[PDB]
Amino acid sequence: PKEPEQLRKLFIGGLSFETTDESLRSHFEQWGTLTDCVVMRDPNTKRSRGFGFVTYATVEEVDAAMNARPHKVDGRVVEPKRAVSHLTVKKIFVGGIKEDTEEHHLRDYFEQYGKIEVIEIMTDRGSGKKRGFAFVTFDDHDSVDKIVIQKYHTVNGHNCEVRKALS
Ligand SMILES: c1cnc(N2CC[C@@]3(CCOC3)C2)cn1
């Protein structure tokens, strides 16, 4: 059972124009088996477009590569991101938590996706009653990107709806 290829891909932005298929592969093979690795180039000049893609054999290998950031590739710090499902944010909306879900429920669950900086459990402006949704802010976008591709999120026995949240 192979994970869908789309979930095993990293877009790599900010490449040095001297990075090649081969040097990008040599770099990112340190964190897993690469089934594909390409530098995007102009069709006429062959000059690099400054970005590429790598595809790992498993999602755990994608995780390993993201956890090894920052990546300096051929002398330049590059910008890896998981393929789109890019709206790059650090904050999620968590809905369906009802009125019994507390901060530690959200923290104990979401801390395994990334480092949490803010948890905001929403309350009614007039009564102070919990409204049944929350916002979690992380220190980095990959946490959110991992979270929103999951089909399900179970927190405090609730099946939650989780979406990217923007400013
Ligand atoms: C994260 C960030 N960017 C991504 N894009 C994919 C290729 C792109 C669209 C067409 O040309 C450039 C940019 C994907 N995932």
Numbering used by the authors: 7 to 91, 101 to 182
Manuscript text:
The human heterogeneous nuclear ribonucleoprotein (hnRNP) A1 is a prototypical RNA-binding protein essential for regulating a wide range of post-transcriptional events in cells. HnRNPA1 ability to carry out these wide range of functions is encoded in its modular domain organization consisting of an N-terminal unwinding protein 1 (UP1) domain and a C-terminal intrinsically disordered glycine-rich domain. UP1 is composed of two RNA recognition motifs (RRM1 and RRM2), which, despite having a high level of sequence similarity and recognizing similar optimal motifs (5′-YAG-3′, where Y is a pyrimidine), are nonredundant and functionally nonequivalent. Using the XChem facility at Diamond Light Source, we carried out a large fragment screening on UP1 protein crystals.
Fifteen fragments were identified to bind to the RRM1 nucleobase pocket, all interacting with key residues in the two ribonucleoprotein consensus sequences (RNPs). Interestingly, all fragments identified on the RRM1 nucleobase pocket formed van der Waals interactions with the conserved F17, F57, and/or F59 and frequently π-stacking with F17 through aromatic rings or similar heterocycles. Earlier studies by Vitali et al. showed that in the UP1 apo structure, F17 and F59 have correlated alternative conformations, with side chains adopting (i) F17A–F59A orientation (RNA-bound conformation), seen also in the UP1-DNA and -RNA bound structures and the only conformation seen in other RRM–nucleic acid complex structures and (ii) F17B–F59B (anti–RNA-bound conformation), not frequently seen in other RRM structures, including the RRM2 of UP1. Fragments binding to the RRM1 nucleobase pocket modulate these dynamic features by recognizing different RRM1 RNP conformations. Three fragments (Z1373445602, Z1401276297, and Z106579662) sit on the RRM1 β-sheet in an orientation that closely resemble that of the purine ring of the central A2, with their aromatic rings sandwiched between F17 and H101, stabilizing the F17 side chain in an RNA-bound conformation but not altering F59 dynamics. The authors also highlighted that these local dynamics are influenced by the conformation of neighbor residues and the binding of RNA is essential to stabilize one uniform set of conformations. This is consistent with what we have observed in our structures, where the binding of fragments on the RRM1 nucleobase pocket directly locked F17 and F59 in different sets of conformations.
